CSV table of N, CA and C and ligand atoms in Angstrom, one decimal:
chain,number,residue,atom,x,y,z
A,1,UNK,N,129.4,117.3,81.8
A,1,UNK,CA,128.9,116.0,82.4
A,1,UNK,C,129.7,115.4,83.5
A,2,UNK,N,129.7,116.1,84.6
A,2,UNK,CA,130.3,115.7,85.9
A,2,UNK,C,129.1,115.4,86.7
A,3,UNK,N,129.3,114.8,87.9
A,3,UNK,CA,128.2,114.5,88.7
A,3,UNK,C,127.3,115.7,89.0
A,4,UNK,N,126.0,115.6,88.7
A,4,UNK,CA,125.1,116.7,88.9
A,4,UNK,C,124.1,116.3,89.9
A,5,UNK,N,123.3,117.4,90.3
A,5,UNK,CA,122.2,117.3,91.2
A,5,UNK,C,121.0,117.6,90.4
A,6,UNK,N,120.0,116.8,90.6
A,6,UNK,CA,118.7,117.0,89.9
A,6,UNK,C,117.7,117.7,90.8
A,7,UNK,N,117.7,119.0,90.6
A,7,UNK,CA,116.9,119.9,91.4
A,7,UNK,C,115.5,120.1,90.8
A,8,UNK,N,114.5,119.8,91.6
A,8,UNK,CA,113.1,119.9,91.2
A,8,UNK,C,112.5,121.1,91.8
A,9,UNK,N,112.0,122.1,91.0
A,9,UNK,CA,111.4,123.4,91.5
A,9,UNK,C,110.1,123.2,92.3
A,10,UNK,N,109.3,122.2,91.9
A,10,UNK,CA,108.1,122.0,92.6
A,10,UNK,C,108.4,121.5,94.0
A,11,UNK,N,108.5,122.4,95.0
A,11,UNK,CA,108.9,122.0,96.3
A,11,UNK,C,110.3,122.2,96.7
A,12,UNK,N,111.2,122.4,95.6
A,12,UNK,CA,112.6,122.7,95.8
A,12,UNK,C,113.4,121.5,96.4
A,13,UNK,N,113.4,120.4,95.7
A,13,UNK,CA,114.1,119.2,96.2
A,13,UNK,C,115.2,118.7,95.3
A,14,UNK,N,116.0,117.7,95.8
A,14,UNK,CA,117.0,117.0,95.1
A,14,UNK,C,116.5,115.6,95.0
A,15,UNK,N,116.4,115.2,93.7
A,15,UNK,CA,115.9,113.9,93.4
A,15,UNK,C,117.0,113.0,94.0
A,16,UNK,N,116.6,111.9,94.6
A,16,UNK,CA,117.5,111.0,95.2
A,16,UNK,C,117.1,109.6,95.2
A,17,UNK,N,118.0,108.6,95.1
A,17,UNK,CA,117.8,107.2,95.1
A,17,UNK,C,118.4,106.6,96.3
A,18,UNK,N,117.6,106.1,97.3
A,18,UNK,CA,118.1,105.5,98.5
A,18,UNK,C,118.8,104.2,98.3
A,19,UNK,N,119.7,103.8,99.3
A,19,UNK,CA,120.4,102.5,99.1
A,19,UNK,C,119.4,101.4,98.8
A,20,UNK,N,118.2,101.5,99.4
A,20,UNK,CA,117.2,100.5,99.2
A,20,UNK,C,116.3,100.8,98.0
A,21,UNK,N,116.9,101.3,96.9
A,21,UNK,CA,116.2,101.6,95.7
A,21,UNK,C,115.0,102.5,95.7
A,22,UNK,N,114.7,103.1,96.8
A,22,UNK,CA,113.6,104.1,96.9
A,22,UNK,C,114.0,105.4,96.3
A,23,UNK,N,113.1,105.9,95.4
A,23,UNK,CA,113.4,107.2,94.8
A,23,UNK,C,112.4,108.2,95.3
A,24,UNK,N,113.0,109.4,95.7
A,24,UNK,CA,112.2,110.5,96.1
A,24,UNK,C,113.1,111.7,96.0
A,25,UNK,N,112.7,112.8,96.7
A,25,UNK,CA,113.5,114.0,96.8
A,25,UNK,C,113.8,114.4,98.2
A,26,UNK,N,114.8,115.3,98.3
A,26,UNK,CA,115.1,115.9,99.6
A,26,UNK,C,115.7,117.3,99.5
A,27,UNK,N,115.7,118.0,100.6
A,27,UNK,CA,116.2,119.3,100.7
A,27,UNK,C,117.6,119.5,101.3
A,28,UNK,N,118.1,118.4,101.8
A,28,UNK,CA,119.5,118.4,102.4
A,28,UNK,C,120.5,118.4,101.3
A,29,UNK,N,121.3,119.4,101.3
A,29,UNK,CA,122.3,119.5,100.3
A,29,UNK,C,123.4,118.5,100.6
A,30,UNK,N,123.5,118.1,101.9
A,30,UNK,CA,124.4,117.1,102.4
A,30,UNK,C,124.1,115.6,102.2
A,31,UNK,N,123.0,115.3,101.5
A,31,UNK,CA,122.6,113.9,101.3
A,31,UNK,C,123.5,113.2,100.4
A,32,UNK,N,123.9,112.0,100.9
A,32,UNK,CA,124.8,111.1,100.2
A,32,UNK,C,124.3,110.4,98.9
A,33,UNK,N,123.0,110.6,98.6
A,33,UNK,CA,122.5,109.9,97.5
A,33,UNK,C,121.8,110.9,96.5
A,34,UNK,N,122.2,112.1,96.5
A,34,UNK,CA,121.6,113.1,95.5
A,34,UNK,C,122.5,113.4,94.3
A,35,UNK,N,123.8,112.8,94.4
A,35,UNK,CA,124.8,113.0,93.3
A,35,UNK,C,124.5,111.9,92.2
A,36,UNK,N,124.2,112.4,91.1
A,36,UNK,CA,123.8,111.5,89.9
A,36,UNK,C,124.8,111.8,88.8
A,37,UNK,N,125.1,110.7,88.0
A,37,UNK,CA,125.9,110.9,86.9
A,37,UNK,C,125.0,110.7,85.7
A,38,UNK,N,125.0,111.6,84.7
A,38,UNK,CA,124.1,111.4,83.6
A,38,UNK,C,124.7,111.0,82.3
A,39,UNK,N,124.6,109.7,82.0
A,39,UNK,CA,125.2,109.1,80.8
A,39,UNK,C,124.3,109.2,79.6
A,40,UNK,N,124.7,109.9,78.5
A,40,UNK,CA,124.0,110.0,77.3
A,40,UNK,C,124.1,108.8,76.4
A,41,UNK,N,123.1,108.0,76.4
A,41,UNK,CA,123.2,106.8,75.6
A,41,UNK,C,122.6,106.9,74.2
A,42,UNK,N,122.6,108.2,73.7
A,42,UNK,CA,122.1,108.5,72.4
A,42,UNK,C,121.7,110.0,72.4
A,43,UNK,N,121.6,110.5,71.2
A,43,UNK,CA,121.3,111.9,70.9
A,43,UNK,C,120.3,112.7,71.9
A,44,UNK,N,119.3,112.0,72.5
A,44,UNK,CA,118.5,112.7,73.4
A,44,UNK,C,118.1,111.8,74.5
A,45,UNK,N,118.9,110.7,74.6
A,45,UNK,CA,118.6,109.7,75.7
A,45,UNK,C,119.6,109.8,76.8
A,46,UNK,N,119.2,109.4,78.0
A,46,UNK,CA,120.1,109.5,79.1
A,46,UNK,C,119.9,108.4,80.1
A,47,UNK,N,120.9,108.2,81.0
A,47,UNK,CA,120.9,107.3,82.1
A,47,UNK,C,121.2,108.1,83.2
A,48,UNK,N,120.6,107.9,84.3
A,48,UNK,CA,120.8,108.7,85.5
A,48,UNK,C,121.1,107.7,86.7
A,49,UNK,N,122.4,107.7,87.1
A,49,UNK,CA,122.9,106.8,88.1
A,49,UNK,C,123.4,107.4,89.4
A,50,UNK,N,123.0,106.7,90.5
A,50,UNK,CA,123.4,107.2,91.9
A,50,UNK,C,124.9,106.8,92.0
A,51,UNK,N,125.8,107.8,91.9
A,51,UNK,CA,127.2,107.5,92.0
A,51,UNK,C,127.4,106.8,93.4
A,52,UNK,N,126.8,107.3,94.4
A,52,UNK,CA,127.0,106.7,95.7
A,52,UNK,C,126.5,105.2,95.9
A,53,UNK,N,125.5,104.7,95.1
A,53,UNK,CA,125.1,103.3,95.2
A,53,UNK,C,125.1,102.5,93.9
A,54,UNK,N,125.5,103.2,92.8
A,54,UNK,CA,125.6,102.5,91.5
A,54,UNK,C,124.2,102.3,90.9
A,55,UNK,N,123.1,102.4,91.6
A,55,UNK,CA,121.8,102.2,91.1
A,55,UNK,C,121.4,103.2,90.0
A,56,UNK,N,120.5,102.7,89.1
A,56,UNK,CA,120.1,103.6,88.0
A,56,UNK,C,118.6,103.9,88.2
A,57,UNK,N,118.3,105.1,87.9
A,57,UNK,CA,116.9,105.6,88.0
A,57,UNK,C,116.2,104.8,86.9
A,58,UNK,N,115.1,104.2,87.3
A,58,UNK,CA,114.2,103.5,86.4
A,58,UNK,C,112.8,103.6,86.8
A,59,UNK,N,111.9,103.5,85.8
A,59,UNK,CA,110.4,103.6,86.1
A,59,UNK,C,109.8,102.3,85.7
A,60,UNK,N,109.1,101.7,86.6
A,60,UNK,CA,108.4,100.4,86.3
A,60,UNK,C,107.2,100.6,85.5
A,61,UNK,N,106.5,99.4,85.3
A,61,UNK,CA,105.3,99.4,84.4
A,61,UNK,C,104.1,100.2,84.8
A,62,UNK,N,104.2,100.7,86.1
A,62,UNK,CA,103.1,101.5,86.6
A,62,UNK,C,103.5,103.0,86.9
A,63,UNK,N,104.6,103.4,86.3
A,63,UNK,CA,105.2,104.7,86.5
A,63,UNK,C,105.9,105.0,87.8
A,64,UNK,N,106.1,104.0,88.6
A,64,UNK,CA,106.8,104.2,89.9
A,64,UNK,C,108.3,104.2,89.6
A,65,UNK,N,109.0,105.2,90.2
A,65,UNK,CA,110.4,105.2,90.0
A,65,UNK,C,111.1,104.3,91.0
A,66,UNK,N,112.2,103.7,90.7
A,66,UNK,CA,112.9,102.9,91.6
A,66,UNK,C,114.3,102.8,91.1
A,67,UNK,N,115.2,102.3,92.0
A,67,UNK,CA,116.6,102.1,91.7
A,67,UNK,C,117.0,100.7,91.3
A,68,UNK,N,117.4,100.5,90.0
A,68,UNK,CA,117.8,99.2,89.5
A,68,UNK,C,119.3,99.1,89.6
A,69,UNK,N,119.8,97.9,89.9
A,69,UNK,CA,121.2,97.7,89.9
A,69,UNK,C,121.8,97.6,88.5
A,70,UNK,N,121.1,97.0,87.6
A,70,UNK,CA,121.7,96.9,86.2
A,70,UNK,C,121.0,98.0,85.3
A,71,UNK,N,121.6,98.4,84.2
A,71,UNK,CA,121.0,99.4,83.3
A,71,UNK,C,120.1,98.9,82.2
A,72,UNK,N,118.9,98.3,82.5
A,72,UNK,CA,118.0,97.8,81.5
A,72,UNK,C,117.3,98.9,80.7
A,73,UNK,N,116.3,98.4,79.8
A,73,UNK,CA,115.5,99.3,79.0
A,73,UNK,C,114.7,100.3,79.8
A,74,UNK,N,114.2,99.9,81.0
A,74,UNK,CA,113.4,100.7,81.8
A,74,UNK,C,114.1,101.8,82.5
A,75,UNK,N,115.4,102.0,82.2
A,75,UNK,CA,116.3,103.0,82.8
A,75,UNK,C,116.6,104.2,81.8
A,76,UNK,N,116.1,104.2,80.6
A,76,UNK,CA,116.4,105.3,79.7
A,76,UNK,C,115.3,106.4,79.7
A,77,UNK,N,115.7,107.6,79.6
A,77,UNK,CA,114.8,108.7,79.5
A,77,UNK,C,115.2,109.7,78.4
A,78,UNK,N,114.1,110.3,77.8
A,78,UNK,CA,114.4,111.2,76.7
A,78,UNK,C,114.5,112.6,77.4
A,79,UNK,N,115.7,113.1,77.6
A,79,UNK,CA,115.9,114.4,78.2
A,79,UNK,C,115.5,115.5,77.4
A,80,UNK,N,114.5,116.3,77.8
A,80,UNK,CA,114.1,117.5,77.0
A,80,UNK,C,114.1,118.7,77.8
A,81,UNK,N,114.4,119.8,77.0
A,81,UNK,CA,114.5,121.2,77.5
A,81,UNK,C,113.2,121.8,77.3
A,82,UNK,N,112.6,122.5,78.3
A,82,UNK,CA,111.4,123.2,78.1
A,82,UNK,C,111.4,124.7,78.1
A,83,UNK,N,110.3,125.3,77.8
A,83,UNK,CA,110.1,126.8,77.7
A,83,UNK,C,110.9,127.7,78.7
A,84,UNK,N,110.8,127.4,80.0
A,84,UNK,CA,111.5,128.2,81.0
A,84,UNK,C,112.9,127.7,81.2
A,85,UNK,N,113.4,126.9,80.3
A,85,UNK,CA,114.7,126.4,80.3
A,85,UNK,C,115.0,125.4,81.4
A,86,UNK,N,114.2,124.3,81.5
A,86,UNK,CA,114.4,123.3,82.5
A,86,UNK,C,114.5,122.0,81.7
A,87,UNK,N,114.9,121.0,82.4
A,87,UNK,CA,115.0,119.7,81.8
A,87,UNK,C,113.9,118.9,82.4
A,88,UNK,N,113.3,118.1,81.5
A,88,UNK,CA,112.2,117.2,81.9
A,88,UNK,C,112.6,115.9,81.3
A,89,UNK,N,112.4,114.8,82.0
A,89,UNK,CA,112.8,113.5,81.5
A,89,UNK,C,111.6,112.6,81.4
A,90,UNK,N,111.3,112.2,80.2
A,90,UNK,CA,110.2,111.3,80.0
A,90,UNK,C,110.7,109.8,79.7
A,91,UNK,N,110.1,108.8,80.4
A,91,UNK,CA,110.4,107.4,80.2
A,91,UNK,C,110.4,107.1,78.8
A,92,UNK,N,111.5,106.5,78.3
A,92,UNK,CA,111.5,106.1,76.9
A,92,UNK,C,110.6,104.9,76.6
A,93,UNK,N,110.5,104.0,77.6
A,93,UNK,CA,109.7,102.8,77.4
A,93,UNK,C,108.2,103.1,77.2
A,94,UNK,N,107.7,104.0,78.1
A,94,UNK,CA,106.3,104.5,78.2
A,94,UNK,C,106.2,105.8,77.5
A,95,UNK,N,107.1,106.2,76.7
A,95,UNK,CA,107.0,107.6,76.1
A,95,UNK,C,105.6,107.9,75.6
A,96,UNK,N,105.0,106.9,75.0
A,96,UNK,CA,103.6,107.1,74.5
A,96,UNK,C,102.6,107.4,75.6
A,97,UNK,N,102.9,107.0,76.8
A,97,UNK,CA,101.9,107.3,77.9
A,97,UNK,C,102.1,108.7,78.5
A,98,UNK,N,103.1,109.4,78.2
A,98,UNK,CA,103.5,110.7,78.7
A,98,UNK,C,103.8,110.6,80.2
A,99,UNK,N,104.7,109.7,80.5
A,99,UNK,CA,105.1,109.4,81.9
A,99,UNK,C,106.5,110.0,82.2
A,100,UNK,N,106.6,111.0,83.0
A,100,UNK,CA,107.8,111.7,83.3
A,100,UNK,C,108.4,111.3,84.7
A,101,UNK,N,109.6,111.9,84.9
A,101,UNK,CA,110.3,111.7,86.2
A,101,UNK,C,109.8,113.0,86.9
A,102,UNK,N,109.1,112.8,88.1
A,102,UNK,CA,108.7,114.0,88.8
A,102,UNK,C,108.5,113.9,90.3
A,103,UNK,N,108.5,115.0,90.9
A,103,UNK,CA,108.4,115.0,92.4
A,103,UNK,C,107.2,115.8,92.8
A,104,UNK,N,106.5,115.4,93.9
A,104,UNK,CA,105.4,116.1,94.3
A,104,UNK,C,106.0,117.2,95.1
A,105,UNK,N,105.1,118.2,95.4
A,105,UNK,CA,105.5,119.4,96.2
A,105,UNK,C,106.2,119.0,97.5
A,106,UNK,N,105.6,118.0,98.2
A,106,UNK,CA,106.1,117.5,99.5
A,106,UNK,C,107.3,116.6,99.3
A,107,UNK,N,107.9,116.6,98.1
A,107,UNK,CA,109.1,115.7,97.8
A,107,UNK,C,109.0,114.2,97.6
A,108,UNK,N,107.8,113.7,97.6
A,108,UNK,CA,107.6,112.3,97.4
A,108,UNK,C,107.4,112.1,95.9
A,109,UNK,N,108.1,111.1,95.3
A,109,UNK,CA,108.0,110.8,93.9
A,109,UNK,C,106.6,110.9,93.4
A,110,UNK,N,106.4,111.5,92.2
A,110,UNK,CA,105.1,111.6,91.7
A,110,UNK,C,104.9,110.6,90.6
A,111,UNK,N,104.0,109.7,90.8
A,111,UNK,CA,103.7,108.5,90.0
A,111,UNK,C,103.7,108.9,88.5
A,112,UNK,N,104.2,108.1,87.7
A,112,UNK,CA,104.3,108.3,86.2
A,112,UNK,C,103.0,108.7,85.5
A,113,UNK,N,101.9,108.0,85.8
A,113,UNK,CA,100.6,108.3,85.1
A,113,UNK,C,100.0,109.6,85.7
A,114,UNK,N,100.6,110.1,86.8
A,114,UNK,CA,100.0,111.3,87.4
A,114,UNK,C,100.8,112.5,87.0
A,115,UNK,N,101.9,112.3,86.2
A,115,UNK,CA,102.7,113.4,85.6
A,115,UNK,C,102.2,113.7,84.2
A,116,UNK,N,102.5,114.8,83.7
A,116,UNK,CA,102.1,115.2,82.4
A,116,UNK,C,102.9,116.3,81.9
A,117,UNK,N,103.1,116.5,80.6
A,117,UNK,CA,103.8,117.6,80.0
A,117,UNK,C,103.1,118.8,80.4
A,118,UNK,N,103.9,119.8,80.9
A,118,UNK,CA,103.3,121.1,81.3
A,118,UNK,C,103.4,121.3,82.8
A,119,UNK,N,103.2,120.2,83.6
A,119,UNK,CA,103.3,120.2,85.0
A,119,UNK,C,104.6,120.7,85.5
A,120,UNK,N,104.6,121.5,86.6
A,120,UNK,CA,105.8,122.0,87.2
A,120,UNK,C,106.5,120.9,87.9
A,121,UNK,N,105.9,119.8,88.2
A,121,UNK,CA,106.5,118.7,89.0
A,121,UNK,C,107.5,117.9,88.1
A,122,UNK,N,107.5,118.2,86.8
A,122,UNK,CA,108.4,117.5,85.9
A,122,UNK,C,109.7,118.3,85.5
A,123,UNK,N,109.8,119.5,86.1
A,123,UNK,CA,110.9,120.4,85.8
A,123,UNK,C,112.1,120.2,86.8
A,124,UNK,N,113.2,119.9,86.2
A,124,UNK,CA,114.5,119.6,86.8
A,124,UNK,C,115.6,120.6,86.3
A,125,UNK,N,116.5,121.0,87.2
A,125,UNK,CA,117.6,121.9,86.9
A,125,UNK,C,118.9,121.2,87.4
A,126,UNK,N,119.7,120.8,86.5
A,126,UNK,CA,121.0,120.1,86.9
A,126,UNK,C,121.9,121.2,87.6
A,127,UNK,N,122.3,120.9,88.8
A,127,UNK,CA,123.2,121.8,89.4
A,127,UNK,C,124.5,121.0,89.7
A,128,UNK,N,125.6,121.8,89.7
A,128,UNK,CA,127.0,121.2,89.9
A,128,UNK,C,127.2,120.7,91.4
A,129,UNK,N,127.7,119.5,91.5
A,129,UNK,CA,128.0,118.9,92.8
A,129,UNK,C,129.4,119.3,93.4
A,130,UNK,N,129.5,119.0,94.7
A,130,UNK,CA,130.8,119.3,95.5
A,130,UNK,C,131.0,120.8,95.7
B,201,LIG,O1,86.7,112.2,93.7
B,201,LIG,C1,87.3,111.8,94.7
B,201,LIG,O2,86.6,111.4,95.7
B,201,LIG,C2,88.8,111.7,94.7
B,201,LIG,O3,89.3,111.5,93.4
B,201,LIG,C3,90.6,111.9,93.2
B,201,LIG,O4,90.9,113.1,93.8
B,201,LIG,C4,90.7,114.2,92.9
B,201,LIG,C5,90.4,115.5,93.7
B,201,LIG,O5,89.2,115.3,94.4
B,201,LIG,C6,90.1,116.5,92.6
B,201,LIG,N1,89.7,117.7,93.1
B,201,LIG,S1,88.8,118.7,92.1
B,201,LIG,O6,87.6,118.9,92.9
B,201,LIG,O7,88.5,118.0,90.9
B,201,LIG,O8,89.6,119.8,91.9
B,201,LIG,C7,91.4,116.7,91.8
B,201,LIG,O9,92.4,117.3,92.6
B,201,LIG,C8,93.5,117.6,91.9
B,201,LIG,C9,93.4,119.1,91.7
B,201,LIG,O10,94.3,119.5,90.6
B,201,LIG,C10,93.8,119.9,92.9
B,201,LIG,O11,92.7,120.0,93.8
B,201,LIG,S2,92.4,121.0,94.8
B,201,LIG,O12,93.5,121.9,94.8
B,201,LIG,O13,91.2,121.7,94.4
B,201,LIG,O14,92.2,120.3,96.0
B,201,LIG,C11,95.0,119.4,93.7
B,201,LIG,O15,96.2,119.7,93.1
B,201,LIG,C12,97.3,119.5,93.8
B,201,LIG,C13,98.4,118.9,92.9
B,201,LIG,O16,98.0,117.5,92.6
B,201,LIG,C14,99.8,118.9,93.6
B,201,LIG,N2,100.8,118.3,92.7
B,201,LIG,S3,102.2,117.9,93.3
B,201,LIG,O17,103.1,117.9,92.2
B,201,LIG,O18,102.1,116.6,93.9
B,201,LIG,O19,102.6,118.8,94.3
B,201,LIG,C15,100.1,120.3,94.0
B,201,LIG,O20,100.4,121.1,92.9
B,201,LIG,C16,101.1,122.2,93.1
B,201,LIG,C17,102.4,122.2,92.2
B,201,LIG,O21,103.2,123.3,92.6
B,201,LIG,C18,102.0,122.4,90.7
B,201,LIG,O22,101.5,121.2,90.3
B,201,LIG,S4,102.0,120.3,89.1
B,201,LIG,O23,101.8,121.1,87.9
B,201,LIG,O24,103.4,120.1,89.4
B,201,LIG,O25,101.2,119.2,89.2
B,201,LIG,C19,101.0,123.5,90.5
B,201,LIG,O26,101.7,124.7,90.5
B,201,LIG,C20,100.9,125.8,89.9
B,201,LIG,C21,100.6,126.8,91.0
B,201,LIG,O27,99.8,126.3,92.0
B,201,LIG,C22,99.8,128.0,90.3
B,201,LIG,N3,99.3,129.0,91.2
B,201,LIG,S5,97.9,129.7,90.9
B,201,LIG,O28,97.0,129.5,92.0
B,201,LIG,O29,97.4,129.1,89.6
B,201,LIG,O30,98.2,131.1,90.6
B,201,LIG,C23,100.8,128.6,89.3
B,201,LIG,O31,102.0,129.1,90.0
B,201,LIG,O32,101.2,127.6,88.3
B,201,LIG,C24,101.8,126.5,88.9
B,201,LIG,C25,102.2,125.6,87.7
B,201,LIG,O33,101.1,125.2,87.0
B,201,LIG,S6,101.0,124.4,85.7
B,201,LIG,O34,101.4,125.2,84.6
B,201,LIG,O35,102.0,123.3,85.9
B,201,LIG,O36,99.7,123.8,85.5
B,201,LIG,O37,99.9,123.4,91.4
B,201,LIG,C26,100.4,123.4,92.7
B,201,LIG,C27,99.2,123.7,93.7
B,201,LIG,O38,98.0,123.8,93.3
B,201,LIG,O39,99.4,123.8,94.9
B,201,LIG,O40,99.1,120.8,94.9
B,201,LIG,C28,97.8,120.9,94.2
B,201,LIG,C29,96.9,121.6,95.2
B,201,LIG,O41,96.7,120.6,96.2
B,201,LIG,S7,96.4,120.9,97.7
B,201,LIG,O42,96.2,119.6,98.3
B,201,LIG,O43,95.3,121.7,97.8
B,201,LIG,O44,97.6,121.5,98.2
B,201,LIG,O45,94.9,118.0,93.9
B,201,LIG,C30,94.8,117.3,92.7
B,201,LIG,C31,95.0,115.8,92.9
B,201,LIG,O46,95.4,115.0,92.1
B,201,LIG,O47,94.7,115.3,94.0
B,201,LIG,O48,91.8,115.5,91.3
B,201,LIG,C32,92.0,114.5,92.2
B,201,LIG,C33,92.6,113.3,91.5
B,201,LIG,O49,91.7,112.8,90.6
B,201,LIG,S8,92.0,111.8,89.6
B,201,LIG,O50,91.7,110.5,90.2
B,201,LIG,O51,91.2,112.1,88.4
B,201,LIG,O52,93.5,112.0,89.3
B,201,LIG,C34,91.5,110.9,93.9
B,201,LIG,O53,91.5,109.7,93.2
B,201,LIG,S9,92.5,108.5,93.5
B,201,LIG,O54,92.8,107.9,92.3
B,201,LIG,O55,93.6,109.1,94.2
B,201,LIG,O56,91.8,107.6,94.4
B,201,LIG,C35,91.0,110.5,95.4
B,201,LIG,O57,91.7,111.3,96.3
B,201,LIG,C36,89.5,110.6,95.6
B,201,LIG,O58,88.9,109.3,95.3
């Protein structure tokens, strides 16, 4: 649990949270906002924070991901390992809606209600930073 990169296979991107709270993905290994710290706030729960800006990955009430300055309830995710050995993170708040953290092929954040268990857009591979 050192700063990791959240690599999404659908499109091959690095999930990232911009200074202005925008969350999306990118292919530049040199991006200053792709370094995330993953705090485990319980047995299968986690917090994902932009070390570069302090912001925490959070999903609003409509499934849109954004960067929150404080770590509220909307910032927890149930980190799960899947079949092909990837990690998928589903919003704990909306767990019942099956809303995950995901990236579209073109690297733009994939809306929570547009994601679903099984989709390749929800697969992330933590890679080592620096
Ligand atoms: O009716 C209207 O007027 C409109 O209503 C809504 O629009 C509808 C579409 O009209 C409708 N078309 S359909 O006629 O019903 O088919 C439908 O489009 C869906 C279709 O699934 C599909 O359509 S199409 O290809 O025929 O055009 C297409 O799929 C997109 C994905 O959405 C996109 N996801 S991404 O994550 O953003 O990139 C992307 O998928 C990639 C990914 O790599 C991966 O997807 S995902 O699992 O991560 O989601 C997946 O990978 C597959 C791989 O392709 C596959 N290869 S093989 O060919 O099977 O061998 C294999 O390797 O497996 C993997 C993994 O699979 S799995 O195990 O995870 O399942 O798929 C690929 C991929 O296909 O490329 O790209 C595809 C293709 O798109 S592209 O543009 O052709 O490149 O579009 C979606 C879509 O959501 O748009 O449904 C929409 C939405 O309807 S809804 O409203 O009911 O949701 C729409 O409504 S509105 O609400 O937006 O207003 C309005 O546009 C119109 O009003």
